[PDB]
């Protein structure tokens, strides 16, 4: 009877919940980007633009008896106010499946939702680690002033740790001493486990050495985790929305509004 009309809320609160836990757990296991960087608090659905800050140059601070140095970061001559994109994916649910779940009193099948959420999280990781290049957004691998460190021999056990060291030294001379987070391509990430080197890299980082599929070829980035160097503005988190109905089925969209803003471009170091 309910499926005879274009239904407003086809699912009741039980399956809406079940969908919410499904998406939240799938994404939570899937995500590799959020772990690297702290999110900026939830602004809301209305917010679409946030102040994009740049802080080129270093003002490490002052020591004084009388506090007269007057040091203070300078705002960029023109605030750019970058806009917040939308990351989304779509999945179908069959009306016969919904009614079968309702009459059977059995859990509803949300495999399509889990797949859509995993793909949306993967696309989020792509946006974080690489710029859109059509929207004009700036990624970790496309940022100006990436502090490229050459990668010479890499398979001898000393070399892998040495390259991370040298990247740390570059960050040191550029002014960032904060905790380090290391993100590696799958190839060299798996390779690094040959000599137990991964634990040493993790200890040097002190915040986590993780692996991302999206990085292609050799790809290691060391990034000061701290706020005021990189941030993730969240307008609205992972949600599921109902895209009307067509052909009696029920399309839905896994949705999130994220923006990665690199406040200080010298806080990252690619290989």
């Amino acid at each position: 009877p309910d499926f005879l009309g274009h239904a407003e809320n086809p699912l009741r609160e039980e399956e809406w919940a079940r969908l919410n836990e499904t998406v939240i757990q799938v994404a939570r296991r899937s995500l590799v980007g959020r772990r690297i960087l702290d999110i900026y608090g939830p602004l809301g659905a209305g917010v679409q633009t946030v102040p994009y800050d740049e802080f080129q140059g270093v003002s490490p601070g002052a020591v004084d008896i009388v506090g007269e140095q007057e040091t203070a970061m300078v705002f960029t001559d023109a605030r750019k106010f970058k806009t917040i994109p939308i990351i989304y994916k779509d999945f179908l649910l069959h009306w016969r499946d919904i009614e079968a779940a309702r009459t059977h009193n059995m859990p509803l099948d949300v495999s399509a939702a889990a797949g859509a959420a995993a793909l949306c999280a993967q696309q989020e990781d792509e946006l974080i680690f690489y710029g859109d290049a059509r929207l004009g957004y700036e990624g970790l691998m496309t940022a100006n002033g990436r502090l490229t460190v050459p990668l010479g021999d890499w398979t001898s056990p000393g070399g892998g740790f040495q390259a991370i060291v040298e990247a740390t030294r570059k960050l040191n001379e550029q002014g960032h001493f904060g905790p380090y987070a290391v993100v590696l391509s799958p190839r060299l990430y798996s390779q690094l486990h040959r000599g137990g080197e991964i634990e040493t890299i993790r200890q040097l980082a002190s915040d986590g050495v993780y692996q991302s599929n999206r990085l292609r070829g050799e790809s290691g980035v060391v990034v000061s985790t701290g706020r005021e160097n990189m941030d993730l503005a969240v307008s609205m988190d992972m949600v599921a929305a109902y895209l009307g109905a067509s052909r009696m089925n029920h399309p839905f969209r896994v949705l999130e509004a994220l923006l990665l803003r690199i406040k200080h471009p010298d806080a990252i170091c690619t290989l």
Binding site: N20, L31, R35, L37, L43
Partner: peptide
């Protein structure tokens, strides 16, 4: 009725 971020940051 607040924002209530859903998937909390791992950090």
């Amino acid at each position: 009725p607040e924002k209530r971020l859903t998937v909390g940051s791992l950090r």
